[PDB]
Amino acid sequence: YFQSMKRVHVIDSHTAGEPTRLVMEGMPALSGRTIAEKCDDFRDNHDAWRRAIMLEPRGHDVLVGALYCAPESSDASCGVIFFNNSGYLGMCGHGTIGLVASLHHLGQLTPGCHKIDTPAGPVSATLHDDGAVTVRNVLSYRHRRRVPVEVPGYGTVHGDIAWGGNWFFLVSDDMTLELDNVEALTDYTWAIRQALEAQSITGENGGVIDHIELFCDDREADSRNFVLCPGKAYDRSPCGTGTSAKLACLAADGKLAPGQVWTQASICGSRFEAFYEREGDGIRPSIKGRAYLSADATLLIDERDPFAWGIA
Amino acid sequence: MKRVHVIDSHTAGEPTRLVMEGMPALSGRTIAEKCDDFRDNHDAWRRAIMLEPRGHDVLVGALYCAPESSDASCGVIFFNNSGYLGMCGHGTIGLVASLHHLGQLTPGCHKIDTPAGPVSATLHDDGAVTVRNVLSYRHRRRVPVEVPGYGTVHGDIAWGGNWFFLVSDHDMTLELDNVEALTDYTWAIRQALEAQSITGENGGVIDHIELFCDDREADSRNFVLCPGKAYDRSPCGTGTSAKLACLAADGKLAPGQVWTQASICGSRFEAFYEREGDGIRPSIKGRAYLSADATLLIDERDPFAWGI
Ligand code: NA
Predict the structure, then answer these.
(1) What CATH number does domain A138-289 carry, 3.40.50.150, 3.40.640.10, 3.40.50.300, 3.10.310.10?
(2) Which member of A74, B79, B106, B259 has the greatest number of CB atoms within 10 A?
(3) Chain B contacts in chain A segment 247-276 (CB below 8 A)
């Protein structure tokens, strides 16, 4: 068949348009008592494998990979290591929805509430009767409100600096957010990101603000957004962490009450439903979204191929 | 869920998705007729396979078909995220290599039926594939074009299966880490030509731009802007055919003399030509390698089932 090649079984899915590659069998065996030590093992001793499935030509820039792992915790359903074409992640909301929907379609997870171990600790994910998944996000908060930043080529932009599991600069209403305009939106948000760094504008404790999000009105959602992610990429989904940061700002401005659902549309019209409860002076947001399968695949690595382990 | 069996491969870095079973049956007796049927009655399947999130913008699709002609090994319909192609050199290499790996083609010269006529491809005993390109020729030599923000650029206008502007020179450094600047420059050139109505013969839009530089191992390295502000990961079989045509016209390369072209990612094709009219018949040799054996899955509940 392809007996001279290395075979890796993956299940590709997308969460509201943002793709996840779940890796099931064939990947190097990892050692460690916890998911974090396994992630170190992957990084230190098996990184070529991350590169083979995430770099071109097998991977493409927007993909997140998710390696299925045995559970660490006694009450966890499984463990997972997330990664991309540049390195290893901690938590990954859209990837977790992908993981859960994937394992759902394989019968390994059934409706109800599941704990999932990650290198950054446990994540609670509820699989609903209808196949949707709600993931409870980390504590989220706003650091600063309506901070002006002069962006060469665009003048002065105001935005909130907030934390939702990543640092965001949120600019909420006159670019408008259509999918056919992503080049211009990327240029703009990129200019903002560069200006923040040039001008030493950070999150709490020096945190680099590496995500930029724009919000506008939407006919059938509370808002539509465009989200610049690290590496000049945009999120196809409404962005779980970005939407968590948005809710923190809404809460801090008294525009959204605990328990109240906010519906966030993405640049491509997919949607997340979100709500929060108060935790101290911050919020605990939950993000509900839906993933669908893309492929059940055997990745093939042919050692004769000059790009077997990925193009730089 | 709809299930579609694909073999993904790449040819010098440029990926091909070979569709094998699972698609609706296409009506027609010629590959041309089956392509029209695909386009008119089953286009959503092209989009499901090629648009995000299942496909990506550098991918070419190839639907395996029964051969129409007695001496052809098979038929193929090539397509991408915008529509349907006729011939596709790099996809033909991936097709042939894939069939070889499936045990369906053995080394030798093969004829493959496409909507734009037959393509001759030789599968060599070492697994390489030579594809014979359409007749290629230079239309104009050293045409000057004034590019807003970059100055005056010269290049040949040549046909290789697509219309190309081949840039005479530039101080751009053709390295993979510089694709953003190279795209900006070549896109500006492309827009400049179209604004000044600088075209191929018959008003043909020059939608590909090629830059060349020296290489330590190959005769040349290029960067190729393709439609969609995308770049070719391979040396570009049609752009290399166009280049040979220019070399041949300049008497810089003789019939049968091999030229080796490196790509922006350091992958390589070998090329040579024989004369045919006042143009050339080039052949392009490269290699394809497998990426995945996959079942694409289309869930009708998915708002993006048939692509974003
Ligand atoms: Na609204």
Answers:
(1) 3.10.310.10
(2) B79
(3) 268-270
A-chain residues near B293 (CB < 8 A): 2, 297-298, 300
**Helix segments in A46-108, DSSP class H:** 47-54, 93-105
- Rounded CA-CA distance A197/B159 in Å is 46
B1-133+287-308 CATH: 3.10.310.10
A249 is a catalytic site residue: no
Q: Tokens for B103?
A: 């045990």
The answer for residues whose C-beta is within 8 angstroms of residue B227's C-beta and 6 or more apart is B82, B207, B208
Does residue A166 sit at the B interface (CB-CB below 8 Å)?
A: no
Helices (H), chain B: 31-41, 43-50, 89-101, 179-195, 237-249
Select from A166, A172, A162 the least CA-distant residue to A218: A172
- Cβ distance of B299 and A312 shorter than 8 Å: no
**Measured torsion, CA atoms of residues B34, B36, B40, B44, in degrees rounded to the nearest 10:** 60
- Cα(B238) to ligand 1 centroid in Å equals 49
Closest CA to B99 of B271, B288, B285: B288
CA distance A32 to B36: 56
Residues 6+ apart with CB under 8 A from A210: A166, A167, A193, A229, A230
